[model samples]
Target: GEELFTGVVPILIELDGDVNGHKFFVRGEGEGDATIGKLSLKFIATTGKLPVPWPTLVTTLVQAFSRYPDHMKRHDFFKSAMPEGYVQERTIYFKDDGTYKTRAEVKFEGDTLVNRIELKGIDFKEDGNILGHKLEYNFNSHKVYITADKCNNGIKANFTIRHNVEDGSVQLADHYQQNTPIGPDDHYLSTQTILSKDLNEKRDHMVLLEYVTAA
Candidate 1:
């Protein structure tokens, strides 16, 4: 009998770490009449030390919301949030000499699973020279929704990036406001990036939501 494949597969990719870079991939599947499945989690630890203590990293990262100012700091915080128990899963740590160390340690807590990763004898460098890396992710059985935005001109755009599952060659999204209804001549601008349009007064303009996606 031919297998029937229905529904969209839900895959969540979460990235963490700073001096050490980590990438996680999670997906769910359906079994029989029930959505019963397991989570496969892993971590990749790269060479370098993480600035700030573990707890401090978490606190700072959770508090700093904006992506522009605190991107690197936020990355450090998420990396430190990894619970200790799961550090044993399928982990890979990169060495300064450009070699990789791999291991597997898998454990779970309710709906969330844990994975641990440690880089041997590496120090975190704030100068961005030392590459610190870590990632925790789970693969389960489920469905996911992918959304795209359509401009008034009938152009639809996908705000996400696609990457290779094995070699990690990723295509990033172009994050620019394109095809906007309002042009430079439509408004009075003090500078190139800033606009002097007054919100209190009645304004005739179109506000469009910019599209963005992960790699």
Candidate 2:
């Protein structure tokens, strides 16, 4: 029988912090040996971000992980993605023949945390569209920032593995936001983590896969 996640799992996947090493999988407070990738929606969202929460060097960072809920979800995003005033009152329809798309522009290569990933850019290719939805959001990252920003013509959240030179014994403030000079300010989603700990995990990868076209 499946189990409900009554609590949290700080690090669903533990890394040795090595350049190249296998991830150590840990079960969270859920039944059926589930990991973050298994039940992201089962957690909360209003506090900090996911995969890794905000705040600096605290040995064990607690956060929730969930899969991408849907692709066609209309952007409830109500801010100007670009310096110009744009908005999405409805969902984008599929006009392209591609069943799924690339998992890109989720770029992050800052020395914030172990496997510290910061989605840098959000992109959408316009080949076809239904009633005016030309771009398909890559995933939640896409849907949340990139898609809203790009669709409305605005921010990016790219991520990739990079070197972190920050000290672990001390707490450092890690924050970044993107917006055109004329648009609203960057959404406040700052987080601080040990540049020495690998927050990356296999379950996260799986969750991302499921979030993407891997359905």
Candidate 3:
């Protein structure tokens, strides 16, 4: 048996700009067997808020790892090492009032077939309420499908993953919907293309994921 990576390997995971100016990234390291060595976070800005929220971003990026090829599993350790029941702080601004800052969390009990999101924040009546939503996901070797509200309104997101081992690059094309401010039925088509994390051992690679919306 030959060992490709003998020690710690640096890694990076990034989210495209689907949620305005907020850019999310994880600076982590993994062992040869895909075990997490260290994990940290970086962002483009710290103020403002996003409708998409942090749980959605984290879940999307971690699930993107499942599509990595077997050989690339060395850097795909994040999918397994990511902590469950993780809490994320969220700040949502309301026109009636000001900013409502609260905590949002996610949990994956088994293997991420079920992504449970808990929000302890404001509700539709413009008041405080506890809301719970489940985002179910399924994936084969090549594709991934996640339900926004479990097909209630056919609100789902899908992704196709492709990797090039020669260049140490991975690509994911994701299709999802964004509810516009104009109306309830106003749904915009947003697509994200995720690129490589790294291939060499020197940790020189950076994450490049992009998303564009069509009117």
Candidate 4:
């Protein structure tokens, strides 16, 4: 006979809405809906608090639509969100600081509608036990790069969206987890091409949520 073990499964959630005039995209480790105020779990270990509260952040953005129409003017957010051809490419960078850098690239190589999004930073966050520290997002070569400056610890990420595909029927999409405790030289990386064309029925706005946990 063989012995088996079971681990805790990280929870995932996805929601969609318009914040101001810019289409918002958020994916990170946590539970509950960010649209309301129940988003949690993705927090800083030292502080035990979310670096930034998404509900307050998003709400503030949406509430300024009328008073700050100029500021809320549609930008280049949708330029490359979900493309016609989607691909996920990951890279790891090693530095002398004794920390490993993990870069997850989401590339869209086909000519299609530009979500016109600005990848100023990854629109998501995860617990420190999952993605190390100091996460940055940058876009180049039609690719979105999510970088974790230090990943010499733990890593786990997963996402599941309850929505309809192109066939016009809603279904449950299962996105399992990748849990691993790492070391200084361990380069942990994972990616998924998990985008559908009809995710947003109105095609006006969308939400992307991700959860990562390692224990």
TM, every model: 0.19, 0.18, 0.23, 0.18
What's model 2's lDDT at 86? Answer: 25
Candidate 1 lands at a TM-score of 0.19
User: In candidate 3, what residue range of length 10 has the lowest lDDT sum?
Assistant: 128-137
Ranking by lDDT: 3, 4, 2, 1
Mark the regions of model 3 whose C-alpha exceeds 4 Å error after superposition: 1-5, 19-47, 62-215
Point out where model 2 deviates above 4 Å. 1-24, 29-156, 160-162, 165-188, 194-215
Which stretch of 10 consecutive residues in model 4 shows the poorest summed lDDT?
59-68
The per-residue C-alpha lDDT of model 3 at residue 101 equals: 35
- Give the root-mean-square deviation of each candidate in angstroms: 21.5, 19.1, 18.9, 21.6
* Candidate number with the higher TM-score (1 or 3): 3
Write model 4 residue lDDT over 122-200, tens digit each, in one string. 3222332112323222111111122222442222323332322234433232232222221122222221111112343
Compared with the true structure, what per-residue lDDT tens digits does model 2 show for residues 23-101? 1221222211123233221111222222222111121211112221234122212211211222111111112221111
Predicted model with the maximum lDDT = 3
The lDDT for every candidate, in the order shown, is: 0.21, 0.22, 0.29, 0.23
Ranking by TM-score: 3, 1, 4, 2
User: Once model 4 is optimally superposed onto the true structure by TM-score, how far is the C-alpha of residue 215 displaced, in angstroms?
Assistant: 19
Please write out the lDDT profile of model 1 over residues 16-65, one tens digit for every residue: 43323433222222111101111121211122333322211111111001
Each candidate's number of clashing pairs is 27, 22, 0, 16
Over 4 Å off, model 1: 1-102, 121-128, 131-215
